[PDB]
C-alpha cells in the first residue's frame, strides 16, 4: 500500500502545481555574500514569530492589487513551511486571522464563506487540517481511498481505452464516455521482466504497445511505489516465438498505419499478437494526426450506472469512514468546529445553516474533497486522466451530500439522501462530544513539529518570502509605522536591518 | 570477429525453417508449424575466417506481414526463397519477395535459393504437378530469375538431404565480404 511520508504528502498539498516543492533549490547566493544573508533570514524568522508583525504583513499583501490569488496560496504555503516549528503559534496566527474573516462577511453575505481563496487564511486552514489529519488519513481513511483507487483503475481497464482522446467503455462522465464501440478481444499474456520470472498480465488486443506496457508493469511491480518503480521510457516491449523469439514492438514504427493525414498507433491486434505470448520488458536501445479508436472531430444513464454500480461497493465505505460516528471525533476537527462555534456567538448568528457552510467549507469541502478529488496526495501513484474524471464525480457526489441544497445529481440520486443523513449524523457527534481544551490542544500541536521528520525547505521559504517583501517593501513600511504599537516594537527598523542583510 | 545478419524470406512452406534448422543442427524438423519470427545461431569458418551467422526466420503468410518488416533492419545478406516443386512459390519471388526486400533494403545482396531439390527428381511428386497441369523449376529457369532480380548468386539445395545446403550459407558469407 504506497503511502507518501509526511514530507511528500505536505509538499504535494502546500505546493501542488509544480508537483515538487519549489522550496528545494539552493538560495542562489555566492559564497562571498552567502553567510551575511543566511544570518539576516534568521532575523526574518524571529520577526515572523511576532503575531503583531505577521497580522499587518498579510493584511497589507491582501489589499495590494498586484497580489493574485496564486500568490495568496504560495504566501500561505511558504508561511506554513516557515511556521512548521511554532505550530501552537501557527494556530494562534489563524485563531486571530479567522476572527478577522468573520467580521468581513457580516456586511455582504455570510453564507458565501470559505468558497474561493480571495483571502490567504482560506489556504492556511486547508494546510492546517492537513498537518493535523495526516495521522488519521494514513491510519483509517487511507485504506478505502486506496481501495477505490485500485477498484476504479481495475474496472476501467476491463474496457477498451483510446490512448489519444482519452475515452473508455467505463467512466462516470459523458465528456469522457466512449460513445462508439470497437472490436476488442481479451488477452492474457505471460509477461517477463528482463532488466527473470514470468507473471501473467491481462491486456486487450486493442491496447497500444504503450498501454499494454503499463498494464504489464502494474503486475510486474504490483506493490512497488512509483518512485521505487523504474521509468517506463527506459523500457521496451519484446515479443517471443519459437526457439529464439526476439522482436521489439513499439507504439509507432515501420509498421505504422498511415492514411494521408491519419496515422494509427500500433496495437497488439495490429501485430497479430496471440493469447499467452511471451512479452518481455527489456531496456531501451534508441504533422500527421495520430489516432487509436476514434479519430477526433444526450446522456447514456444506462452506461454510467453500470460503472457507478461497480464502484458503489467502496464509494459507500470511503464515506462511511470519513463521516464515521463509530470512531471518535479527531481533536483537530472538534477543536476547529468549536473554534467556529466560539465565533458564531461573538457576532450573533443563531442560524446553524449559515454556521454549517463555514463548517462544510472547513473540514470536508476544504480538506476531504481534495483527497477524494486528487489521491496523489496520500499515495505514490500515477493517476489517469479518465481516473480523475471518475474521482472528481465521486467528490462532487460527496460535496452534494455536505451542502444542504446534472450527471452526478440524477445519477447518485439514490445514495445522495443516504449520505445527507451521514453528514448530519457526523455533525451530531461534533456538538454532542466533550469539547477540546486549548490546554489539551497545544499539547498535540507541539508533538507535530516533533513528528514532522525534517526541513520541508524553510531556508528557501524565508528567502522566497523575502522575494515578496522586496517587491512590496514600502507598502509594508506604511502599516509598519501607521500603528502605534508597531513604533514601540521598533518593527520598521527590525525589517530595515534584514532588508540590508540580504542586499 | 565479423558477425553476419542473415534474413531468410520465403513463400509459405518453401522449407526455410527446415533449411535453417538442417544447417544449424544437422537434423530435419518433420512437423509443419507456420513460423512467426524465429532466430537461429551458428559459428562458421569460411576461407580461414571465423564468422557468427545470426539467422532470422520469417513468415510466408499474408497474416504475419503486418510484422515481418521488423526483421529487416541492418541485414548484411538476404536469402530470397522458393521451392523447386512449386512454380507458385517461385513466381511470388518476382511478385512478393523481391519487391518487399528492396522497398526497404536497397543495398543488401540477395541470393535466390531453390529448396526441396530431392523432390524435383522424384517421379511421384511430378504426378501431382501434372494433375494440376504444372511443371517443376529447373536450373536455367531459376538462373534467369536470379540475374533478373539482381541476386549475387543462385543456389539449388535440399534440407532433408543437406545437399548443397553447406554451400548456400558459405556463399552468403562470401556475398558480404566483397
Ligand atoms: N523432401 C523435402 N521436404 C522439405 C524440404 N524442406 C522443407 N520440406 C518440407 O516442406 C515443409 C517446410 O516446412 P518449413 O520449413 O516450416 O517451410 P517454411 O518456408 O519455413 N514455412 P513458413 O513460411 O511458415 O516460414 C515441411 O512439411 C517439410 O517437411 C526438403 O528439402 N526436402
Ligand atoms: Mg515457416
Numbering used by the authors:
A (entry chain D): 1563 to 1757, 1764 to 1854, 1880 to 1890, 1916 to 2023, 2032 to 2129
B (entry chain A): 1 to 178
From the paper:
To address whether the N-terminal residues missing in the Plexin-B1Δ1 construct might harbour an important site for RhoGTPase mediated plexin activity, we solved the crystal structure of the entire cytoplasmic domain of Plexin-B1 (Plexin-B1cyto) in complex with Rac1*. The 4.4 Å model is of high-quality for this resolution range, reflected by the crystallographic R-factor of 23.4% (Rfree = 26.4%). The asymmetric unit contains a trimeric arrangement comprising three copies of the Plexin-B1cyto-Rac1* unit, with each Rac1* molecule contacting two Plexin-B1cyto molecules. This arrangement is not the result of crystallographic symmetry but does show near perfect 3-fold geometry (120° between pairs of Rac1* molecules and 117°, 119°, and 124° between the copies of Plexin-B1cyto). There are no major conformational changes within the three Plexin-B1cyto-Rac1* units when compared to the one-to-one complex. This 3-fold arrangement is mediated by a previously unidentified second binding site for the Rho-GTPase on Plexin-B1cyto (site B, the previously observed Plexin-B1 RBD-RhoGTPase interface hereafter called site A). Site B involves the N-terminal region of α-helix 11 and the loop preceding it (residues 1913Plex–1923Plex) plus α-helix 16 (residues 2036Plex–2039Plex) and is in close proximity to the putative Ras binding site. It covers a total buried surface area of ∼570 Å2, therefore significantly extending the interface for Rac1 binding, and is dominated by hydrophobic interactions. The site B interface on Rac1* is predominantly formed by residues that precede the switch I region (residues 24–33). The conformation of these residues is known not to depend on the activation state of the RhoGTPase; thus, the specificity of Plexin-B1 for active RhoGTPases appears to result exclusively from interactions with site A. The 3-fold complex is further stabilized by contacts between two adjacent Plexin-B1cyto molecules, on the one side mainly involving a loop comprising residues 1808Plex–1813Plex, and on the other side a surface directly adjacent to site B (residues 1919Plex–1938Plex and residues 2036Plex–2044Plex).
Plexins constitute a large family of semaphorin receptors that mediate the repulsive chemotactic response necessary for axon guidance in the developing nervous system. There are four classes of Plexins (A, B, C, and D). Their architecture is conserved across the family with a large extracellular region including the ligand binding sema domain, a single transmembrane spanning helix, and an intracellular region that transduces signals to a number of downstream pathways. Plexins are transmembrane receptors distinguished by their ability to interact directly with small GTPases of the Ras and Rho family through their intracellular region. They consist of two domains, the GTPase activating protein (GAP) domain, first identified by sequence similarity to RasGAP, and the RhoGTPase binding domain (RBD).
